[PDB]
Design an enzyme around this catalytic site. Sequence first.
Site, short mmCIF file in Angstrom:
data_model
loop_
_atom_site.label_atom_id
_atom_site.label_comp_id
_atom_site.label_asym_id
_atom_site.label_seq_id
_atom_site.Cartn_x
_atom_site.Cartn_y
_atom_site.Cartn_z
N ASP B 295 0.79 -1.22 0.00
CA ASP B 295 0.00 0.00 0.00
C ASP B 295 0.82 1.27 0.00
O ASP B 295 0.61 2.16 -0.80
CB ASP B 295 -0.89 0.03 1.24
CG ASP B 295 -2.11 -0.88 1.10
OD1 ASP B 295 -2.05 -1.86 0.34
OD2 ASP B 295 -3.17 -0.65 1.70
N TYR B 382 -9.87 -1.70 1.03
CA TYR B 382 -9.47 -1.78 2.44
C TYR B 382 -9.53 -0.40 3.13
O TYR B 382 -9.00 0.56 2.60
CB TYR B 382 -8.00 -2.22 2.70
N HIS B 437 -6.27 -13.97 2.32
CA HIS B 437 -5.19 -12.99 2.23
C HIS B 437 -4.71 -12.61 3.63
O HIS B 437 -5.39 -12.91 4.62
CB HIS B 437 -5.68 -11.72 1.52
CG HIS B 437 -6.86 -11.08 2.17
ND1 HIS B 437 -8.13 -11.60 2.09
CD2 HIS B 437 -6.97 -9.95 2.91
CE1 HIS B 437 -8.97 -10.84 2.78
NE2 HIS B 437 -8.29 -9.83 3.28
#
EC number: 1.4.3.21
Lengths: 642, 642
Positions: B295, B382, B437
Amino acid sequence: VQHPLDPLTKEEFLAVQTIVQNKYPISNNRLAFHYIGLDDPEKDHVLRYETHPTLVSIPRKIFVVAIINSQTHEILINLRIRSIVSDNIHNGYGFPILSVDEQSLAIKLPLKYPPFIDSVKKRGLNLSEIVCSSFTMGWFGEEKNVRTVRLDCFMKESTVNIYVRPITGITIVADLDLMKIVEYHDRDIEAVPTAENTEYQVSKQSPPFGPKQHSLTSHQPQGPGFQINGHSVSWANWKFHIGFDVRAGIVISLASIYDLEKHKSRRVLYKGYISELFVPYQDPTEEFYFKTFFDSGEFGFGLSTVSLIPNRDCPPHAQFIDTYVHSANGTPILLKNAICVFEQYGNIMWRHTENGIPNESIEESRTEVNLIVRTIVTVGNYDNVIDWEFKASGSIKPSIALSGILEIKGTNIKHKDEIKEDLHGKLVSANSIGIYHDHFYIYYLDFDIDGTHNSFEKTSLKTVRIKDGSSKRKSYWTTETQTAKTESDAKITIGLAPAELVVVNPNIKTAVGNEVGYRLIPAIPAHPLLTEDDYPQIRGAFTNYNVWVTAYNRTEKWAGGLYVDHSRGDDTLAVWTKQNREIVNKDIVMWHVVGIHHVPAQEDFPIMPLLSTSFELRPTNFFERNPVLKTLSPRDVAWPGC
Amino acid sequence: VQHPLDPLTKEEFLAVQTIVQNKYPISNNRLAFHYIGLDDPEKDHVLRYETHPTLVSIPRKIFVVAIINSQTHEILINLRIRSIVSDNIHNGYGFPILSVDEQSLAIKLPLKYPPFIDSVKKRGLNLSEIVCSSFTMGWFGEEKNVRTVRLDCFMKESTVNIYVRPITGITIVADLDLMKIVEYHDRDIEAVPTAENTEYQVSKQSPPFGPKQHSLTSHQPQGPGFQINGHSVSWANWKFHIGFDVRAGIVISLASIYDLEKHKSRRVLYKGYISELFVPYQDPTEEFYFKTFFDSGEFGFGLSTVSLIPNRDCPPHAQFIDTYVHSANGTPILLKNAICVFEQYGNIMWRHTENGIPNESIEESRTEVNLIVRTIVTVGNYDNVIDWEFKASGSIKPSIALSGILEIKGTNIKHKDEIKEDLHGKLVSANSIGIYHDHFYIYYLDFDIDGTHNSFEKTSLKTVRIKDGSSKRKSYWTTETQTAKTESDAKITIGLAPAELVVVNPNIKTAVGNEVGYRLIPAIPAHPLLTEDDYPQIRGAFTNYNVWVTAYNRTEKWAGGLYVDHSRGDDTLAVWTKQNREIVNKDIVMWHVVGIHHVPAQEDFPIMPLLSTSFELRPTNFFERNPVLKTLSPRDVAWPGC
Ligand SMILES: *[C@@H]1O[C@H](CO)[C@@H](O)[C@H](O)[C@H]1NC(C)=O
Ligand SMILES: *[C@@H]1O[C@H](CO)[C@@H](O)[C@H](O)[C@H]1NC(C)=O
Ligand SMILES: *[C@@H]1O[C@H](CO)[C@@H](O)[C@H](O)[C@H]1NC(C)=O
Ligand SMILES: *[C@@H]1O[C@H](CO)[C@@H](O)[C@H](O)[C@H]1NC(C)=O
Ligand SMILES: [Cu+2]
Ligand SMILES: [Cu+2]
Ligand SMILES: [Mn+2]
Ligand SMILES: [Mn+2]
Ligand SMILES: [Xe]
Ligand SMILES: [Xe]
Ligand SMILES: [Xe]
Ligand SMILES: [Xe]
């Protein structure tokens, strides 16, 4: 109005006292009540009552453990008809919970014991400012089976913080039945730590104080979101019963969550409590070798529950529930503010900001209101803040927070550079050793996941290596779910292999076909550091695994055995599970051990800032989808709310 | 007024844009700004500035990563004199953080690409209601080094919840430099999951709603207990600086606690932030093998920070701090409500009830007010709620909570009984696989424990067996403290052996002689389940240990390397520590990896309830005694009425 799982009332304790005294008058009997509690109603009767609560009649039955003329009696009473149904003598090892009264008598003995008086004088200490405390002594292989304790003493004088002022170096053993000192050995003269700066009461402290903490005031315009009808709580999508027992302390029963999508109340937890504690110290010398308290079975978690201080132990506007305990002669004692219930605000329930749709701003964030049921148990120097938190999302979060006072061993040492051997603790202040120790708590968790017939699943995470060119990836992980067949398959040491631990109902599935369940999200696990053959570890063998699952059994309640004082460890959870019963698609119970290793630091002295622990019981394919998808945040309301 | 560690202002972003444009005019150059941030001032200068903040002058220096004419430039700017001090081409592997503008262009490409148009028509889907997203692809051993991404597409129609409606089975690779699709393979036709009941916006939901949550209103009679002077926070006994960077997101600096007993401000944390994320998916097929987002280095934690929604993301009366980010052409963008600061009430600070003194009732329970600094980072599906909590007791508690949407892989399967092979996730809804994940986050924690010269100590808990008859106990545990000598000694896999991990200042001791320190109390650790040699795990090698300690080094900032997109993993924390430097009594930094393994459950759908994680940094012989021994509870004020 009275629910079958309600705690014993004042009136019920008095009737028990009366019925037992009638058979055993105090004129010709020495009579001590060491446990008086509700005999668990049969589960099938309770489940029948739930569905027809105006029609189903369950008699209140009472279990009593009493020492009568130095014999331990097990007495079952039917209070409906005011009769004793059974009265048997316990012939096995171990002894009941110590009474408060006999301790009060035992701790005075040193003060009139000439060898103690002489030992005190030789140290130049003021006899009139000595307080003593009774410590359990357990079992260390001896065939002797008597009710003895060790008595340790402490200086008071300018402070109430007695536990940080031990008179270290004297062995005193007292037999509680005979009420006399049966052993005395003055071994070592150690300095008594100063009283200076040990005070924790604000009225006895001097400036400066700080930092200043700003006040907050708050109000619920529409009042509390929960209603307590007697002991039955209704809050948001939850219903549950608050019970209380002199040994266990708080008991959460009949916990069911309303599923809005199915328009039905669905069971999660039939019964939840802390079954036993184990607090082994790590000093093997004569001073402390014997100190490994089992708080619940040796002192009573309920008996040792304290009154919650409004606005401090609970936030303002918390609702309080009184309970009753009993004394050694069977008299009920009012315990004001034993439990509180309140709501907690501020948490984000869920959210998403979506930025992937060109020319659209999308965001949603909602908040949750959570419910906390709190009680505080103080055994000697340790304070245990016990919470059960419920969330609309279906999570239940049992937590334990620790504060209170360090157990200090006195020493002549004033600085770390003077240490020439293992002290079995850290030097936390001049003359003051904080002895290493553990706190282990074991929860009984009788999950009835959407019904009684359940299974325990271990979902292992396993690594697969790709060697055949079938992917650019060399690896991935996947799950492999195994149902525990017998009790030996459900003894888990957390942290050995990655896995989710789930209790499921194999008979009930979501529309897509997953079994409905709840999973445990544990905190970092403590494992035992005593050897398996050490006497305190045998007695505390329930700490040998972090998680256990057993077949439901009425009589299996107390993980260290029914009788814990001087126990031989022949009646623990470890022993029960040697039967290795089947636990597939049937009424099963989870036991979960939580704990810490305490390496004392100076911040813990002279009184210790809260150390919080928690685990979460999280719905896992229990609902078809996010159960709070349609749950609105509490409204915004400008101060002062009208 | 401007502090040297402050975030870049609007004015500074504009000056940077101007300075760089002046050397590379847009008339003759293709210019994209991928990162514009503060070049970290030298530590010794910052420490000098702290002691004399009116006298010490530090020039604002800016580090810029720009792609200019398809080459990556590293540009350092001195803003005081508006000059470029250096401009070097990056010659190594990997690429900068993706810009928002090039993604906006990239996601339109499929909608005009005739093979996609035909693939969409063959499935009977409405082309005008398709949205696509750009996914990083990493590196898998190929010698090719180009800026490509995978494009995945989704149906919208009656819902904004696009991620639950994938069009699964199509490979689309786009080169961002060329801005075109360079690869297309229509592999499999999978059903698109229904839009029905995927909506999470209250305005797009229909009754019934529930459960009803009761409102609360609050007020601080004396206002907030914190002040924010620019970016410098004063609260209770703490001072610290709130920073912001387009890559890292929030940065906490110069955290010092006032020790009332010593009357001195004492450093704890020089700098703390989240250095990298790693979110490896576990589907090895062509559909998802490449999906292991970093990220922070691929999308920017700061660039991806969202505006906090008042009264929801933060409680009412929270204070907000605006920041600036930038676009690809270097223009500043106002990010309203990027960070909030508020106070949290209700926690017990410490307590004791004393029942051991005959005829005396003694009880004391005090409450704490805690401080929370919060920011929220949303990258695609997310949402990450990032908190830093400070306590008067000295504890710092960084937390991360997760919400948002599952990444769904579409499938023709409707029920679990239809599954005949490993789907690489759980079936969470009809046609919907929630792919397994992990989330790994790594914190940079530059502790300067009461100064810069520190050591890392591992306090092992060891079992000792007594055999020789010297005790009735067979066993006990004790501590054994080892100081890590080099970086290899400070690579810790939590849970292998019991130990406390402590950063100490070996040059500063308490009066009783213990080294001042802070200890880590971690949550249950996640460990990597990819093989160490897997390409994503090499790139994410910073996750190979739960704790690391390095020698302080200005240039070691980003645990996955400076250039993460298409990285080869030749510039990670794992690579740096092969130098195996000394870390004894010198400026050191701790890195702590926290994470979860996500096994999706139906409750996570269509939007997921918060999953909260935390760790505590707890003072450990840092103070002479309990630092809040003399801290008074907030005063209680009654609701004023109406
Ligand atoms: C001993 O303690 C009592 C208070 O309990 C006090 O009155 C007395 O003066 C003390 N004696 C000495 C020697 O300090
Ligand atoms: C219940 O457990 C106890 C032993 O822990 C045993 O005496 C009794 O037989 C058990 N009953 C059943 C139903 O197995
Ligand atoms: C496709 O969607 C648009 C709205 O974007 C709508 O107006 C149009 O009629 C739709 N066509 C079909 C085939 O449903
Ligand atoms: C400082 O960090 C960089 C990048 O890891 C490295 O090249 C340099 O040699 C480091 N300094 C030392 C002395 O290790
Ligand atoms: Cu402890
Ligand atoms: Cu996840
Ligand atoms: Mn059960
Ligand atoms: Mn440092
Ligand atoms: Xe604890
Ligand atoms: Xe569970
Ligand atoms: Xe998380
Ligand atoms: Xe730490």
